[PDB]
């Protein structure tokens, strides 16, 4: 009756970017990234790998409200180092970790009877 169409939990709707990045005025060298059609599955994973770049001064994320599949990610880094980059890096470190995983799980498997 009033509930959305299921496919609104992953498909971007009419003109909408996965990412929208906004500068934060509250404190220097900080940003808030709006991720559209996403959740903890991906949020918390990005949040995590950032407290890994000891070059990142801050990193938390949140789901405004459960009805809407979106989420905000706030990042702040050291001097003259752009967080967006740290987002790239910490994001890449993620794929590799998984790239390795995929592989280590395949050779491993074959050795089964």
């Amino acid at each position: 009756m009033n509930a959305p169409d299921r496919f609104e939990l992953f498909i971007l709707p009419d003109d909408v970017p996965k990412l929208k990045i906004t500068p934060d005025s509250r404190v220097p060298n900080c940003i808030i990234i709006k991720f559209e059609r996403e959740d903890h599955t991906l949020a918390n994973l990005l949040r995590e790998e950032l407290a890994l770049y000891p070059d990142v001064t801050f990193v938390a994320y949140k789901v405004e409200h459960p009805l809407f599949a979106n989420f905000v990610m706030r990042l702040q880094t050291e001097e003259g180092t752009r967080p967006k980059q740290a987002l790239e890096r910490a994001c890449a470190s993620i794929i590799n970790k998984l790239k390795t995983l995929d592989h280590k799980f395949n050779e491993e498997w074959n050795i089964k009877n």
């Binding site: 299921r6 496919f7 939990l9 992953f10 498909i11 970017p17 996965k18 990412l19 990045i21 991720f35 996403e38 903890h40 599955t41 991906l42 918390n44 994973l45 990005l46 949040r47 995590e48 790998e49 967006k84 987002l87 790239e88 994001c91 890449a92 993620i94 794929i95 590799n96 970790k97 998984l98 790239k99 390795t100 995983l101 995929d102 592989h103 280590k104 799980f105 395949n106 050779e107 491993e108 498997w109 050795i111 089964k112």
Partner: protein
């Protein structure tokens, strides 16, 4: 070989126990849910009933078939009806099925085995009534009496567990870590003795016991996770792990891709 590492334990066709070490829980969990919800599959989605004298109603059966597990091997070389340039559907993005059931044998049953595959499979593993039943007719759709008929026509499509549960190929997944509460990520309830009143897990044997004389370790983090990946069919227990590991990756990709599309301007 490199970063995180696996160490499979007893594994079969409908399960895959294994230990995942050298990874942040955060990341284990992420993969956890990804299997549970976002791996492309193939389920019946549209049902065009023609005749039906069964005691079950139209949409009741319709539901049923939505759940019947279909093949989803080369599910990846098919397209989402939403992206296919064909008005409605076609061989390039769907699998059509037939079902005819006339009551002749004066209780006749309708098993998922009774499904035809009227459209062109284009020579790719997909659209098959996954049967694991001992006899050879897995999933009793429904029963019917004397002269009750029933003619359908199903159309299957890609989709995922987000869109609907009728998709996710996961179906239950075990997850545990640090069986001996060393990290103290829990405060055991108890009347007198926590340890005696709280069942010890079968997982406590691949990690060393506590050892009293030691003070509380703090700098230690959640490393190593004992899991188990059950499958319902559609995709091989192994893949339901691989593909998972990969889709999560594809997503992490666009987050980096979408990124790039925003630097030029």
């Amino acid at each position: 070989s490199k970063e995180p590492k696996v160490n499979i334990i007893n594994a079969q066709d409908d399960e895959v126990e294994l230990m995942l070490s050298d990874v942040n829980l955060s990341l284990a969990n992420s993969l956890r849910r990804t299997m549970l919800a976002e791996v492309p599959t193939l389920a019946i989605d549209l049902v065009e009933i023609k005749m039906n004298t069964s005691v079950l109603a139209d949409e009741f059966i319709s539901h049923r078939l939505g759940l019947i597990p279909l093949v989803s091997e080369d599910v990846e070389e098919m397209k989402y009806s939403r992206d296919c340039t064909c008005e409605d559907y076609c061989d390039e993005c769907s699998v059509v099925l037939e079902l005819s059931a006339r009551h002749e044998g004066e209780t006749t049953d309708v098993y998922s085995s009774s499904l035809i595959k009227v459209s062109g499979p284009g020579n790719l593993n997909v659209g098959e009534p996954v049967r694991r039943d001992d006899y050879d007719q897995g999933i009793l759709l429904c029963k019917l009496r004397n002269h009750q008929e029933l003619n359908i026509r199903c159309i299957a499509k890609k989709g995922i567990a987000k869109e609907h549960a009728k998709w996710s190929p996961c179906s239950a997944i075990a997850f545990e870590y640090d069986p001996h509460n060393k990290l103290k990520h829990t405060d055991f309830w108890f009347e007198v003795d926590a340890k005696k009143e709280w069942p010890d897990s079968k997982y406590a044997t691949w990690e060393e016991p506590p050892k009293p004389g030691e003070v509380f370790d703090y700098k230690a983090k959640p490393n190593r996770f004992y899991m188990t990946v059950e499958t319902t069919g559609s995709l091989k227990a192994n893949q339901v792990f691989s593909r998972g590991i990969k889709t999560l990756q594809e997503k992490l990709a666009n987050v980096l891709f979408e990124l790039e599309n925003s630097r030029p301007a």
